[PDB]
């Protein structure tokens, strides 16, 4: 029942990345050192590449939790600028007020 | 203003009063090392009057009571920037020249550790670098300062320059000086030979030596000269600095190592660094130890009034308000009686 298909894709990607975070962490740790043999590093590289694409953490997009806007999303509140402005103007966000100085 | 112009007789009675230098003495003793602004002032006024100050007087007392038998003593002039350390050293240099010493004058050791376009490799020691341009400049200046002693003093070794050219024992030091000057590539080697010969022969009573080094702190500091591979160079690699360090050791006798710290022109030092340790570092302070530090402080009110009167009589202070007591007070405040600040202010005032 997510906002849109793009949000659904993002949710699936987040689930998968969380699921495979540990294995990616370990394999990337193997790849990211100058100590181990380079042959071992190469096999680690091919393996990490062989992991499913959607598990890549970078593929996660921080969309607005409410309207699925892919840009202009404040991380602290996870709300697009439009929705954040709506709520703040209606005074529904604690401690947020129009700035003047 | 003193009728006393002999640099030995004047003392505390002359403290705070001027001391004149004749044009011939200025040309001979001081072909270099005088502050650029003082050189300009002399050019403008046609006269060279240095106020007699307690630091110079005390250094003169020490040099008059110096026992040439004892190992050469190190005197170190230190003080806030623009306190007149360089000109006090020049005053003592003139006194020594009139007493007929041999003045080994380093106008500024800072120049020898920075901004060198021509930095070759020493032929005598392949691990050391040459500074031929500055070496030749200083050699010319030293020749001018000490021509009269130059011929009289003899060498005591065989000094090869090329695979075929050399200087033979008993040759006058003027031969070495001429070789260094005319042949720029051999300037560093000539400077080293000159320093070594003077240091050895001073212990033999052939003369009284005065090693007067301005900006002595440079020798044991850092240098802004980078190798061909952009590698930083430490001072010891520079033969000139190495030989000068050798000279700066009290191991010999028959002379005095007078030197002045000078933060101006220093490298990797804060602006306010003026104390001996602050300006020398561990290595420099240990090398100079033991030494006699002499403090050069800003003008006391009497000296300040004397300098203001000197400028007024020369007519330098053109501002119509300069002669007034209010103008004098304003100058005193804006300069805190500092010699350099007062001179710069009066320049445009």
């Amino acid at each position: 029942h997510y906002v849109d298909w793009r949000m659904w894709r993002d949710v699936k990607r987040r689930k998968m990345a969380y699921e495979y975070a540990d294995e990616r962490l370990r394999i990337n740790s193997l790849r990211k050192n100058t100590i181990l043999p380079k042959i071992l590093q190469d096999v680690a590289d091919e393996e990490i590449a062989a992991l499913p694409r959607d598990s890549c953490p970078v593929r996660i997009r921080n969309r607005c939790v409410m309207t699925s806007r892919p840009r202009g999303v404040k991380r602290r509140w996870r709300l697009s600028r439009i929705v954040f402005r709506h709520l703040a103007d209606h005074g529904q966000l604690s401690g947020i007020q129009r700035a003047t100085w | 203003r003193t009728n006393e112009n002999d640099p030995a007789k004047h003392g505390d009675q002359h403290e705070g009063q001027h001391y004149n230098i004749s044009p011939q003495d200025l040309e001979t003793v001081f072909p270099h090392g005088l502050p650029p602004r003082f050189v300009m002032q002399v050019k403008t006024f046609s006269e060279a009057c240095l106020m007699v100050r307690k630091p110079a007087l005390e250094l003169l007392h020490y040099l008059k009571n110096t026992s040439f038998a004892y190992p050469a003593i190190r005197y170190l002039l230190y003080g806030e920037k623009g306190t007149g350390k360089t000109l006090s050293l020049c005053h003592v240099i003139h006194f020594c020249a009139k007493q007929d010493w041999l003045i080994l004058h380093i106008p500024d050791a800072h120049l020898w550790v920075k901004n060198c376009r021509d930095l070759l490799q020493s032929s005598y020691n392949k691990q050391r670098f040459d500074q031929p341009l500055e070496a030749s400049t200083w050699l010319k200046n030293f020749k001018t300062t000490n021509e009269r002693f130059l011929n009289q003093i003899k060498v005591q070794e065989k000094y090869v320059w090329n695979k075929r050219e050399s200087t033979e024992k008993g040759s006058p030091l003027g031969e070495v000086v001429e070789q260094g000057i005319t042949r720029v590539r051999n300037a560093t080697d000539a400077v080293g030979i000159v320093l070594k010969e003077l240091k050895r022969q001073s212990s033999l009573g052939m003369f009284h030596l005065l090693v007067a080094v301005d900006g002595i702190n440079a020798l044991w500091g850092r240098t802004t000269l980078k190798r061909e591979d952009k590698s930083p160079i430490a001072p010891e690699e520079l033969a000139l600095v190495h030989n000068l360090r050798k000279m700066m050791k009290n191991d010999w006798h028959g002379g005095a190592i007078v030197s002045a710290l000078s933060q101006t022109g220093s490298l990797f030092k804060p602006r306010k660094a003026y104390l001996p340790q602050e300006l020398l570092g561990k290595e420099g302070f240990d090398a100079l130890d033991p030494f006699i530090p002499i403090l050069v402080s800003n003008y006391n009110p009497k000296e300040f009034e004397s300098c203001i009167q000197y400028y007024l009589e020369n007519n330098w202070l053109q501002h119509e308000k300069a002669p007034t007591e209010e103008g004098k007070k304003e100058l005193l405040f804006l300069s805190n009686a500092n010699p350099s600040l007062l001179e710069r202010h009066c320049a445009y005032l």
Partner: protein
């Protein structure tokens, strides 16, 4: 109620309180490094590696224990303490002492009287004041007063006044 910052525990102790000798104190200072504020004479250990506050507290106490015991302990390589590895300047066997000794030897040789030796020269009060001034300049902050004291000492030693 969880709060990640809640797990940090700080342990502050004045080294004066710890029963440490001179060598142990110096070794402990070198080991701790910036964790020791000399201005306040306070060693601070901030532990946040363990998840729990109790675990971090236990680890901080353990770190204090191990640091103290190793500081009192001694190791073979310690004997190779170069001058560049000391923070308290020691005039003894120092460059300044060697230089002043050589100067005194030169002065007395010029006097031609071989009534001299290391102990004889170093026993005089003049050397005592000179070394006091040199140590003060080297360790304590330098100023006009200290420089003047050093000047007087050097003048007295060199017999020039």
């Amino acid at each position: 109620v969880r709060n990640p910052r809640a797990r940090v525990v700080v342990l502050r102790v004045k080294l004066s309180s710890l029963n440490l000798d001179d060598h142990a104190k110096k070794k402990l200072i070198k080991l701790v490094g910036e964790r020791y504020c000399k201005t306040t004479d306070v060693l601070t250990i901030k532990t946040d590696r363990c998840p729990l506050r109790r675990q971090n507290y236990d680890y901080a106490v353990y770190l204090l224990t191990v640091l103290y015991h190793e500081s009192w302990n001694t190791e073979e390589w310690e004997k190779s303490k170069t001058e560049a590895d000391m923070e308290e300047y020691i005039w003894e066997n120092s460059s300044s002492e060697r230089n002043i000794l050589e100067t005194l030897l030169q002065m007395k040789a010029a006097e031609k009287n071989m009534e001299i030796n290391k102990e004889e020269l170093l026993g005089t009060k003049e050397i005592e004041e000179y070394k006091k001034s040199v140590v003060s300049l080297k360790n304590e902050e330098e100023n006009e007063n200290s420089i003047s004291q050093y000047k007087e000492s050097v003048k007295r030693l060199l017999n020039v006044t």
